[PDB]
Structure formats: structure tokens, C-alpha cells
Amino acid sequence: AGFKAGVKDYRLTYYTPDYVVRDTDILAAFRMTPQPGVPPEECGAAVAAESSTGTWTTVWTDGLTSLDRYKGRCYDIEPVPGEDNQYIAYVAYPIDLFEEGSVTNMFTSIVGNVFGFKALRALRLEDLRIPPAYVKTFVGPPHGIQVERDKLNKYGRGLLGCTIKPKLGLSAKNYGRAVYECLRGGLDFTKDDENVNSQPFMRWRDRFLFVAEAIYKAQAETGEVKGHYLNATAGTCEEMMKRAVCAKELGVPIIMHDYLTGGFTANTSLAIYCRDNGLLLHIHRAMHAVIDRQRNHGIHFRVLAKALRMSGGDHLHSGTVVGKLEGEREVTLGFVDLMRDDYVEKDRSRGIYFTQDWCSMPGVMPVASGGIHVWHMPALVEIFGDDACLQFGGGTLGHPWGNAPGAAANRVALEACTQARNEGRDLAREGGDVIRSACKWSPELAAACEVWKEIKFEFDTIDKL
Amino acid sequence: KAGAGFKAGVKDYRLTYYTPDYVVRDTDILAAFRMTPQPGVPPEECGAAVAAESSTGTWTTVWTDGLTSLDRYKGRCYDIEPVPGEDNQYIAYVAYPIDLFEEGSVTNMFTSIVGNVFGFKALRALRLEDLRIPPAYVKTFVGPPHGIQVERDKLNKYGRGLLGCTIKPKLGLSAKNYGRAVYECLRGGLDFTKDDENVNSQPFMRWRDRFLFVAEAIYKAQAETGEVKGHYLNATAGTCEEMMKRAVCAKELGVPIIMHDYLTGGFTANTSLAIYCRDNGLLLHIHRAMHAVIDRQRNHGIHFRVLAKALRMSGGDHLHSGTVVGKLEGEREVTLGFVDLMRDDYVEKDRSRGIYFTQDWCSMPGVMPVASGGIHVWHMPALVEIFGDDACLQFGGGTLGHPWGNAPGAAANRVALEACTQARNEGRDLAREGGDVIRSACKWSPELAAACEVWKEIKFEFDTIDKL
Amino acid sequence: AGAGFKAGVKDYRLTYYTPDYVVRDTDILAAFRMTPQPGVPPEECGAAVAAESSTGTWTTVWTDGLTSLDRYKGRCYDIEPVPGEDNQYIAYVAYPIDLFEEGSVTNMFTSIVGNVFGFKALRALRLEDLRIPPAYVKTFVGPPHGIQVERDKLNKYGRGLLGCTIKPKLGLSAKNYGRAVYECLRGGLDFTKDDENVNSQPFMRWRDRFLFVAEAIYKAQAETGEVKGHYLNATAGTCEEMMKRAVCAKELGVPIIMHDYLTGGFTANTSLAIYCRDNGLLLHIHRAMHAVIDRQRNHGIHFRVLAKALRMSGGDHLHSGTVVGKLEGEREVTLGFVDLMRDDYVEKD
Amino acid sequence: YLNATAGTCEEMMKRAVCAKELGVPIIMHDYLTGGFTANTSLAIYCRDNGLLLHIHRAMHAVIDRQRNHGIHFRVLAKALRMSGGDHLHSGTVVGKLEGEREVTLGFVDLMRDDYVEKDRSRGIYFTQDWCSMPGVMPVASGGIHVWHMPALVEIFGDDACLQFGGGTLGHPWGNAPGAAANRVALEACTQARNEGRDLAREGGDVIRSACKWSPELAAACEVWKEIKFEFDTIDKL
Amino acid sequence: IVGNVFGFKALRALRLEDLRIPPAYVKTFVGPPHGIQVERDKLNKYGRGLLGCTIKPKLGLSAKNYGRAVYECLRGGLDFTKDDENVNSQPFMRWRDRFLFVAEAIYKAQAETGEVKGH
Amino acid sequence: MMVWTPVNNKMFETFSYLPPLSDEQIAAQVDYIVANGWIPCLEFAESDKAYVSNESAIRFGSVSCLYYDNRYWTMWKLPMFGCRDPMQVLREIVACTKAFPDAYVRLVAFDNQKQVQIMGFLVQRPKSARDWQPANKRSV
Amino acid sequence: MMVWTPVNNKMFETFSYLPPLSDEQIAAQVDYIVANGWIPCLEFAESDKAYVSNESAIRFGSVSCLYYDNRYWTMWKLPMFGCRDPMQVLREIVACTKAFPDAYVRLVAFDNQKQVQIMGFLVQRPKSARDWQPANKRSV
């Protein structure tokens, strides 16, 4: 009843195994590895405490408010199968603890300081249950999958993108030259590499203008709407906005932003600007692997994906599974659903720890990109379906005949796999046959197939369930 | 007749990106990567892959390379040193030409260096240990709004470490109760108090209400003590528009300092705020919330020293440095290392402290390290010995957890700090005579005696994860 | 084949009367006291109200097929008889959260009470209550400060606050207004206020009044040693004029302004409430015109709904009636909506 | 009419600005649910930027339905004319929403004319002099179809906008055919009136004659032939 | 120069006939937006006086009827037409409506005649 | 179901959705004008200026709202002020169409009290026009 | 090395890069629509209204982002709600092209759950059109 100075176990206040979670609570699933001698209950309580309302010693101020009302609560702990010192600690956070529409604030509490506690050796946030009452405080994505397709007037197949290469070193006009040749061959989009912002070899406004000429030339030539994600990622918000404004003034369809390296605060502002000005926003997840690669520590990508959907983004890279970058099939299928769907049921076999209700927030278009080529098309279409954008950078500018032929080869491979699927063919089994048949009438595809026929990326997976 | 032309297809990255005889230029940005290749992947190839996919190349040969000069722009793995006693670990050094980076953009720098390479299937783990920021690139940044010397000059405080304190409970307090706690803390001897990192604007307390009451608290405590006071008002928000509205309010109230969680808020937003603070005379305290998600493990991530350099470039007058002895992890040698990297103008390479490259800050302002987290009066001797006078030592629970309240709690910490500072100045060895200094002060300070009695038994000692 | 498009009229009840529907916790719920025309079944009348306040019209439209009516349609899920009335019923309607624009009371009212009150098929209709789910409540900024914060800013605790409307209503000059205000405040009243209809007129222009009132506020405060205030009326013909007045109050450093939320409107009120939050001004809300809507038992909108709407749009104060004064206000009903405007959780009663 | 009605004035203006930037001719606003303060501001913006402003009277029946309490619509109509609006729903008389003929003809005059003399037989209690203030276009909308055309033209004359929502998207052949059927019915009735025919008595014959050469109208007439809205009037003089 | 002196009791009448504006003072003024030469160069009209015409009746015409009269005037050979001095913005014709209809008239007449037109 | 054709199905406002007006129906509309004391007037335009367009907007800032070229047509002589003889109106239709046989011609009438055109319809379209459909071909 | 021709090589979105679909391949796509319970619908447009353009932007301020004319085509009758018979769809394609032999016609399908077009491809191109290339002439 009174104030008693001094230190006491966190579990006395923050371990509440009989707590009935509320439908407005934000829930967190932590893969926790305690230091030897630290009871799982105390470790879980410490996490809940230091990410909500408590500190290392008893403070009298608790008495001025109602700790029962605001405290985070570790309400359940389950051992990790096959792990001697690993547990999944579930924590419930009252909705009152979060600032409306601020992913930055949500992350600040949940992952702000707990990962550095001496009492634990490792910690990883696996999932978050974002309640509808909190989802509703966010503007969310500028447009979403359905609106995007409606604005581009594109339906019935996955969209095709392509990152211009070399990553850096090209002049503004050479960039536009590459873009035009890429788009004219059948690709829906092309894009600035994530690290292409504004540099000595190519200033941004010069690139924006030449790319604009390229987009419009390709569109007029093909009769299909074209786009190129112009990078607004910058050192300051003022610079980021100047770039978005220029895209608006040029009448182009889409820009991009590296949400993690730029930051959630900047990203949310940009997403809002895109909503109010009609610009599609492609989101690049640069730096994500720094945080989500290891199984024992960090934040799983599914959480980073939910966070982006909340902050706002029409596109979000999802991995390719079969490409040069890691992405295990089951967890990828899991977060792709979390990115696109309105309601996703709990499914541990896919790393989905909580049932997620998006309460009508627009879905984000997954982007499969990185070290993929024509022979991967069957698998890509089989894994993602039509609602995705498959990007081929090296897979286009690496074609022996140039960008246009390279683009046509990918567009042909995509439509052939799409046609076959619609006909009821099993892409997982007949993928190769579908591609080979297309090669008979498509010399562009035949050339691409011959160049990369033996190329595959198969390594031991680090990010395992 | 026919020179080097375009040949479609895949070839090893090492054929272009592994250059062991390359002589680094003084304008090159250097990176030290602790990499763990997948079985069967030569360190030369893995290293070349990292340099390639963080600079100019992709998985297959592109014809466009011929339109420019790859030799001029490509990143280069120029050296690979094996890591003793570790499981297939190597330190791969990569040099990046200055042309690859957007001036004054920490966001761009990170985008290239740590953008995609950490996810490659060809490697099992990767950790950026250090970065050599050349003077030519340092000069493209506005840097910290003020820096240590200017801060002391504006606050008119010299001769001792500064004292801070995080208000508690973390969340749940109303605006007026926040101001109440702040006033009581500051009037007792603390130089600063602050919003918890997660205190932004919430149902239980909206930001503008907090700013106003805190302002009253700041001015009351200052008038009462006759010493300049401050409270880091959190400008961290969901959008830049909200962030700026909060900074503008602090400016309009004439208060001395605000704070920002640079990692959860972001570099783009942080740089904008730092610039605003420079142009409006506001001190900017930086909280490193989320850093441990990235810098805790030895095998993967980014070491805090790099995150510290990044913040210094983006802009920050204060930056949490850890306590070493507190509730959060922070190995002594590693800590002393990045503290120098945060404050000094020139830091020589010293692997015994995790300093892989000699760093020249070319006169960019030094950042005030802030030791915070689970520390109390008995830790004072150790803290003063580790950090010296140029630091801010914060006691949240260590103040609001005092049995007599905030003012007495603040006095106890202020007394402990001044006693330790006096002892050191007189030539006493704090590492050895610390306890005696504190016990001696207890004789004439009832406030300190009470604090000492409550936390005498409390210590934080665990196996260190982030070892050199 | 399957369900197709069939042009023509059919009963609303076939699509909008769902007596077995289980309301979702995010649905906005409405309780309508409905009086159908003779010959019109209660379920059909309730169905019409649900349909015309959500997704349907008088005849079948083929466009329904492009979307999902099951997902968007309003549903009359319950019809309750009214004791002492054999032609009056309470019809309950559930509206999916997707039907509403976030943070817009204007939009919520446009759907629920937009057109259904004028249907020939019904003789009278009154909206008695609305269940605002937490998921929708969270989309609103809400009141600029609220009871606790207001008390903390004024430093007043332990007793009800005391106010006073200057009189005569109209006809006083700006200086005489300030004269009456100073004398009122210095005697013990915490606040005084512009009458609801005192905006800016020939006998007293607003800026002149604001200035003299400021002198009166500060003189009374200095004399008594207690924080004082006077609700300066920001109610105007246009939003531009409304904001100019709010800005002047901000510039004078005064504590509080007022707005007639119903005559000024929800759109204007919400904008003002947001301004007050970002500028630290307390906002007193006058309910002028409410009795035109909430007086009769058989038709209109009960004040409790108008109160919930104001709490959502934003207001630090809201007139609640006196029960014992010159204006009507039944005790039980009043106690009920007072809890609805002050408390965090109010059980059905 | 693109809707500018919003939760705040800032959002309302952003929508009006977008309409301006797109070069489109007209926007709308729910003056009672949005409010007079916001409406007056919007009307002023429309005057200064050349946008037509259609006003929807949502919520009016909450206030003007009962004969014993509230505010009669004629007063709400005068208020809107003053606040600002190029269009204002006036009811249909024969549609799904209530609107007694005499009362309606009365406030329609109060909405469009420059001078209206007292006339209690139409609920006009005072002679109203608008002193050249622009007239507001009455909009008859709600539960009306092709067969109502003769009555609508006879009631309102040419200066009005007749709206058919369900009456258009409810046509068995779709929106375009539904639109044509209403346009044909309107022109057929207009032509008949100009020729001196009495729409109050020959309306049905005018429509049937048009059906002979207009399959679109014929299909509409078939679907809604027996649809009428006749109930006891609440808002009686 | 003409502020108070005209009302002095000491005089019965006063009239300012002329003023000598010295170049030193003239130079302190921006002066006319363009001037005769520039005007002729912008309109591309030379060799004859310019022709204008005030629309009538002075007041009472609607915005569209104003544009109608303007178009018919300009298309016949007049270089300009104009608002009567007292035509500003009134109940019978608000200014912005007039500006829009007149613009249509100016452009129609110019396209029809091949000569630059204005109002 | 009949489909309303979007190809070469241009309309001309009032009465364009009815079968072509016979001379008798046209005369009746004229009687309507005279009976109401309205002011008859003919207007014409060449094919290229018959329908609204946006050409001039190229010279505009963001002020195209409700601005369209070709709304104004050319006046045939002057409005027939004081005309109380329909034969008079019919004779001018003949004279106008004779002078401009390949132009679009419409008959309108003005009300000077409300000061606005109160009626109007097309009376001539060039025989070369191929952008319209006969009554029985508006839907297929 | 073959060069992708930029001349008269207009495309038409989904499947336009594959050889012209045979009636058997079209029938297969239709079965796909029915098997998934999607709503079949046909749209058409004359040559001048077939590809995206920017004509309307002349009336805009700086808001042309993602705005293009000609995305909307004309609906053939109404979407075939309820249709569970592929033969019905195939017959409407014939009915539509019969009504408009000189117009572009495309078959689409709507999903009322996601409320978006879920599939689509061109079923008719005016025979007189020469702005496209057969599969064998796309590269030279």
C-alpha cells in the first residue's frame, strides 16, 4: 500500500500468468535467452517492465498513477523446442502506452532498451499483434495493391521491375538511357538502386528529368503505362521532400524510399505526402538483414514488415526465396500474407505467432528481387501469385543482347508461366517445360535461358523457424 | 582486333572486387567487416561479394559497366585478416571511393555499406566493426548542433560531470505530475531530468501539456537554486511535422534542451532536427533506443562505435554511452574506445579497444557521453574514474527511488559526485579509495547516507556478450 | 447460374433485416425509436432505415455485384417493442467500421441521420443512442485537454468550478462587457463568458471585447490571487473569422475560448478543437440549437448522442442542463449522459 | 459533384483545392452535417475559384419533419441561400421522401425567386425580398423514375435538376441505357409542354408515345410501372 | 502641393495649372508598366491608331452577355473592348464570371481574325 | 440488352435525344417562343467550332474550372427584339442556313427578365457530319 | 544479336507478349474465370480511345500524377454476375465483336472480395490496325 524504497524482483509486478489479454492490447512474442541463474519468469518480467513502466528500483511516483492500468505484462512463457536456454515470452501492452499513428513510438517501447540488458544473453522480437484499435490510428499505405493496379490499369499477372546497374557510377543521361531500353522491352518498372540518391557522378534532379523522358518515351512506344521508382531517400527531410515534389511536378507515377536507413519518422511523412499527392511509394528494406538475419537476436522481418505497412508503403521487398539473398519459403509465405491480407490466422508453421486483423488497412505489394532470372519464373509465380512485383536487375541488363531484349525475355517468361498456371498446369512440376516451350518462339528468352541455365543459389538457411 | 568487351554471364566477384594490393586513398571511406562465409565460400570471394554489392556490382555481368569507369567507383576488399579462436570468422577490409556517397547524408552512407550485404545467402553472419570516415567526408556534415565546449559555455557549468535523471514510471504519469517530479528532482542538485525515451505524446499525457508544466518546473528550480537547469523534452514523433512542432514549442518556451531517439526516429529526421537545433540554439540530447537490437552480438550486426560515429555526423550534443557497471551491457575497454571516438578530435588505431582505424574528426564538435541505466551513489567513484568530467551521469531510479523523495535523492547524487570530484582533484585514487570517499561524505550528508543504505547491496555483474 | 442482377424493387428486409447477426466489437451501433406508417411492418421499416443509412437505395442496382454487401451493409439486427406504445419500436442497426471516415463526426452523422428521418414510410424517428467502438474512438483527436488537465492548468481542485454568462445577452459595449466581467470575477467566480449569441456585432465588435476582457481577467486574477478566465466566443460566420478570433486569444495569453458547436458546425468545431490542443487553449462548448433536435421523445436525436458526438469532435466543457433550472433536463437522463461525457467506461443502463 | 464534406475545414479545403486543380466543374457539401461556418467558407472559396457548389441537405429531416417542433425546411432553405449554394435538394413530392406539394412549391419559390409575397396556403408567413441575391437551383431527388417525369416537370419547370440514382443504375440494361431513358423521358415531356400539352393529364400518354421509338425508355417503364410512393403526410400546413 | 492651400480663407479660388517634374524626381518612379513602344511590340500592331470600345449598357448585363457582346465586337475589327469604368463586381454580374467569359471571347475573336485581341 | 454506342454518337443538348424534329414540331417550338414573349435568335458555327474544347487552357494557370472554348457561337444578325410573328423567325432560319449551308445552326430564345437563354435546339448540321447517329442506331 | 523494334510494336498488357491466343487457349482462360467464381465482363473502345494519353492534363495544375485518359473503356452490356457457363462468355465475345467489328475488345473478370479486376486480355484488335507486330517480327 505504501512506498518502500529498494530493489525487488521484476516478476513480483510484471509476471502475470493469469492475465486475460484485452482485444486492444498490443502483444509481443520475444525469443528470450536468459543469463545463467536468471529464472525465465524474472527475465520475461524484466523485458515487460523495462519496455513499459518500470525501472531497476522501486520509485514512489508509481503511487500517483495506476500501475495495474499501464504496466506491460509477461503473461505467458513457453520453452523453445530443441533449446535448453531459450523461451518465447509473451508480453501484453495496454493501448494507452502508444502514441497514435507512430511506429517510431511503438518500437521505442517494445525494442528500445531491453535488448541490451546484462541479465539476458540474447533477445529477438518474433511477432507483434497489432490490434484493430491501434491499426486504425494510422494513415497506412498511400494506396495499396488494388488502387495501384487500378491506377496503372494492370491486371492478371505479376508486375515486372528492374534495378539499374551498375549500382553507382552512371551519369544521369546514361541512367535514363538504360531505363528507356529496359522499359520499352516489356518491364512495367525500373528503379534507382537503393543507394542511388544524389552523388557527384549523378545529381538527383538531373536523373529525375532524364528518367522522366525515358518513362514517357517507353510508354508512348509500347502503349502500356510505365514507371521508374525515383529515390527520395536523403540526408534530411527537407531534401527528401524536395525530391518528392519534383516527381509530383514531372507527373511521374512512382518514387521510392529506404524506410529503415531513412527512418520511420521520415517514412511516415513521405507516405502521407504520397497519399495527398497521388504518388505510388515503393519501399526498399535496406539494412533489414542487419536486424533480422539471426535466429537468436534481433527482430524478425515479419515485424519490420508489419511496421512498414503501418508507417505506409505501396511496395515492400519480400525476398525471393530462390535468389541471392536469404528467405526461407515458409516464413516468407507467412509474412507475404501478413503484408497483403486483411486477416491472417495464427500459424506457427509459418512463424505467425498471433492472429492479425488489419481492419481494412490497404495491403502492401510484395517485391521479389535479387539474383533471380528467367529460370526462376515458374517458382516465383508459384510462390507469390499475381499480386507481386518481380524485379530483374542483372537479369535484364545482363542479357547478351541488351536491355530491351532482356526485358522482353522476362516479360515473356512471366506471361508464359501465368498462362500455364491459369490453364491448371503445375508450375512446380512443369515449370521447366513451360519455359522451354516459350523458348521455341522467343529468341530473346532462349538467349537468356542459355546464359543463366546453370545458375542457382542454394545455401544453408540461417533464419530458420 | 578486339579489346575488353561485354561478356554476358556470371563470374566470381573476386575477379573484380578483391584487390589485395590496392593502396587506400586518404579520401576513401574504410570499413572493417567481421564476416562468416558459408562452408565452401572462400573468404576472398565472400569479401569481394560484400564490397561489390555495397558499391557497384550485382550477381551477373552487366554491359553498362563499360559506359563508366568501374576502377573509379568500385568498392574494394583490399585486405582480409583471419580472426583467432573464432568459428570461420575473418575481418574483411573494404575501401569505398568518396564519390559513392551523398554529402552530409548518414542515411546514404549506411544504405551502401550495410544495405543488402548482411542478407546474402553466401554468408552466415556479418558485423560492421568500424568505419574510417575521412576528413573530406566529415566536412560535408553540419555535425552536432553545439558540442561539449559550447554546451558547457551556454550552461555555465565547469569542473565536474553533469547530472541527469529519467522521470519514472516510464509511462503512465500525467503532465502535471511529470512537472512535479521534475521540479523536485532539479531543485535538489541535478542539472537535468528527461522524458523517458518512449514518452512522446500519449492518452495519459499529451506532449504540449508536458512541455508547459516542465517549463514551469525548470524555471522554478533554476530560480530556487541559482544554477541553470534543463529537462530533455522529447521531440521524437511519428512524423517530421510532429517532431518539428515539438521543437518549435521548446524554442517558443525558451527552454535549453530537447531530445530525440535517433534510431527509432531515423537519421533523415535526426539530421533535420540537429540542423534546426543549430539554427535555433537548442541543445540536443540523443537517446540510442533500439541500438542493442543491432550492436549486442559479436557475430552479426553493427558495433555501437559505428552507430556512435554515425550519430556524431548526423548531429547530437549528447549520446548515451552505457555505464559499464549499470543494468545494461557495456564492456570497459570497448566503451572507453567509443567514448574517445565520440569526444576527441583525433583517435589513433587501437585494437585493444576495438578501434580498427585511426579516426580524424577534422574539428567536428565532440559529443557528450551520457552514462545512464541502473546506477546509484556507490557507482559514482567508478563512473567518475571511467568518464572523467566530460559526461552526464543520469540517475532515474537512483533519484526517484530515494527513500526521502526526489530532492533528497538528487542531493545525494550531487553530493556523491562533488565528493568524488574533489577527491580525484586532490590526488586520490577513485578506483581504490572510492568507497572511503563515499563513506566519508555520508558523515555530513544525511541524504547520501540514506541512499547508500538502500543500494549498498545492489550490483550488476554478468558475463559480457559484446566482447572484443 | 449463381446470384445475378435482377432489376426492380424488392423489400429492404430481404437484405437489411438480419435478426441473427452477431454484432462485431468494431461495429458502430445505433438505437432508433421508430414509428412506422400504418401497413409498414416494423422489420421492413427497420430494414429501410438500415439500408438508406448505409449501402442501399429504393430499387436493385447491378453495381452491388462489384463489391460485397455482406461486408459493407448496415444491418437491422433487432427490433424491440416500446412499453406503453403499440406503434413505436426501438430498431437496432449495426454499421461496419469501414463505412466511416476516421476522425469525422460529420461523416458519422451524415450516414446514420442523413436521409432516413424524412422517409414517407415512417411517421417519426429518433436516434436514442450510439455505441462508438474503441477502434473508431481512437481515430479522433478528441477534447483539447479534458477534466484532469484543465484542473491542472487552472490549479483548481476540491470543488465545482463557477461560471457566469454576462447579461443582457446583447446590447452591451465592449468596455461595459469588460467592466461587468471584472466585477464578476473579482467576487469569486472562476469564469464568466460571452453569451452564445455574442460574436461580433455593431454594438460591440469582437476584438474590442477580447481586449477589454483580457484587462478584466488579469485585473481580477491579480486582485484575488486565483487563476481567472472568460470564455471568449470564437463562433463566427466563416472558419477564417473563427480562427482569427482564436489566434487573438492565443496572442493575449488568455486561458479559454468558446464555440457553439451545433450552429457553427462539427467541421468547424473539430478544426478549432485541434487548434486549441496545439496551442494550449481550453475550449468551452455551448450547445445552442440542441433543443431543436433533442426535445421531443418521438422524433430527433437525444442529447446523449449529441454529447458523445461533441466529446469525439472535441470540447473541454459542454453544457449538460441543470435539471432544476429554467431549461428542461430530466434527472435520470441527465445523470446518464453526464457519465457518458465524463467517464471512461459506462455500462448499459 | 465531388464531395468536399469532411471532418475538419482543413480536409474540406484540400478536397476543394484538388477539384480546382483538376479543372472539374462542380463539388458538393452537406451543409447541415458539415455546418454553416464551414459551408460559408466553402461557398466563398467556390465564388473565388469558379466552382459550382451543390448542397446536400443531409440531416434536415431530423429537424424539419414534425409539425409541432423543430424548424421548417423553408427556413433551412433561406439559411442555405444566405450561407451559399448553387444547388439545394428540394424534395420530389412524389418520391420516397416526404414533401407535400403546396409546402414544396412555396419554398422552391423562396429558393429561386427574387421576390416572394406572403402566402399562407403555401406556408409563406412573410413576404421575402431577396434584393438580387442569386437564386438556388432546386434538386428533386430520391425514389423517382421515368413515370414520375411528367409530374416533376410540371411541378418544378425547367429550373431544377432531377436526379435518378436507383432510377439509372437500376435500369435492366445498365447505366448508359438507364441514363438515356431518363434523358428521353425529360425531353419528351419538355417538348410536350412546349407544344401546349397538359402534363398533369397527358403525362402518361407522352411517356407511352416516347416508348415506341425508345427501347431504353420502354425497358425502364416496364420495370417501374407499378412503383409509387403514397403515404400520409406528416409535415402538413 | 494641393493638400491644404485650396481651402484658405485668404483666397477665393485656386487652380494648379502645371507642375515641372525634374528628371531627378522623375527617376525615382517606376513609371508606366510598358509604354507605347513596348505595347505595340507586344500586340504586334503598327501603322495605325488602335481601336477600342466600351460595352453597353454601362451596367445591367450578365457575365455571359458581356462576353457575347465582346466577342461580336472584337471579331469585327476592333483591337480592344472594355469594361465600363463603373463595371467592377455587382449583383447582376460578378467579376470572376465576367473575366472567364471575356477570356473565351478574346480567344475566339483572335483565332477567328488572326489578330491579337484584348479586353 | 441494347448497348448505347460510344462511337460517332455526338449529341447537341436539348431535344437531341428525340427523333429529328419535323418542320411542324419546329414551328410549334417557335410558337412557344412567341407565346411567351421571349426573344428569338439564331447562332451558327463551322464544324471545327461546334463542340466544347480545352485549347485555350494551354495559356492558363490552375483556373480552367468551368472554362471551355466553343460555347459561344456566332450571332446571325441580331436577336429579334419585339418579334411577335413566328413566320419571321422561320424566314431567318431559311436565310441563315442558306448563307451558311455547311455550318451548324441553332435556334435560341432569350428572357430579359431573368436575363438568360430560356430555350434552344439545333436546326442544322452540315451534311458532311459523320459523328452522330440516327435515332434507331444510338444503341446496338 | 536481335534488335527489339520500337516501330509499330504496340502491346496490350497481359499475354500480349505471347503468340496470339488460339480459341482453345482463350477457352482455357474462360474456364479459369468460371473455376474461380470470378465475374466475366467485356469492354471495348475505338482506335482513338485505345491507348493511354494525356489530353485532359491541359486542364490541370500540378496533379497529373497517375492520371491518364483512355484507361476506362466502354462496358459491353453488364458484368456477367452469376455466370457459371464458359459458353455464355464465349458467345458474348462474339456478340460484342459483331456489334463493334472495328473496335478493340478485351475480356476481363472481377473479384468482388478484393474488389478489383483479377484477370484480363485483349480478345479483338481492329483488323485494319498496323501498329503492332506478330511474334516473329518483334525483333530484327
Ligand SMILES: O=C(O)[C@@](O)(COP(=O)(O)O)[C@H](O)[C@H](O)COP(=O)(O)O
Ligand atoms: O541492390 C540489389 O542487389 C538489388 O537492386 C537487386 O539487384 P539484382 O536485380 O541485379 O539482383 C535489390 O536492391 C535487392 O533485391 C535488395 O534485396 P532484397 O530484395 O532482399 O531487400
Ligand SMILES: O=C(O)[C@@](O)(COP(=O)(O)O)[C@H](O)[C@H](O)COP(=O)(O)O
Ligand atoms: O529507460 C531507462 O531504463 C533509462 O531512462 C534509465 O532509467 P534508470 O535511470 O531508472 O535506470 C535510460 O533510457 C537507459 O539508461 C537507456 O539505456 P542506455 O543508456 O544503455 O542507452
Ligand SMILES: O=C(O)[C@@](O)(COP(=O)(O)O)[C@H](O)[C@H](O)COP(=O)(O)O
Ligand atoms: O441517398 C439517397 O437516397 C439519394 O442519393 C437518392 O438516391 P436515389 O436516386 O437512388 O433514390 C439522395 O441523397 C436523396 O435524394 C436525398 O434526399 P433529399 O433529396 O430529400 O434531401
Ligand SMILES: [Mg+2]
Ligand atoms: Mg538495389
Ligand SMILES: [Mg+2]
Ligand atoms: Mg529511458
Ligand SMILES: [Mg+2]
Ligand atoms: Mg447564453
Ligand SMILES: [Mg+2]
Ligand atoms: Mg465608360
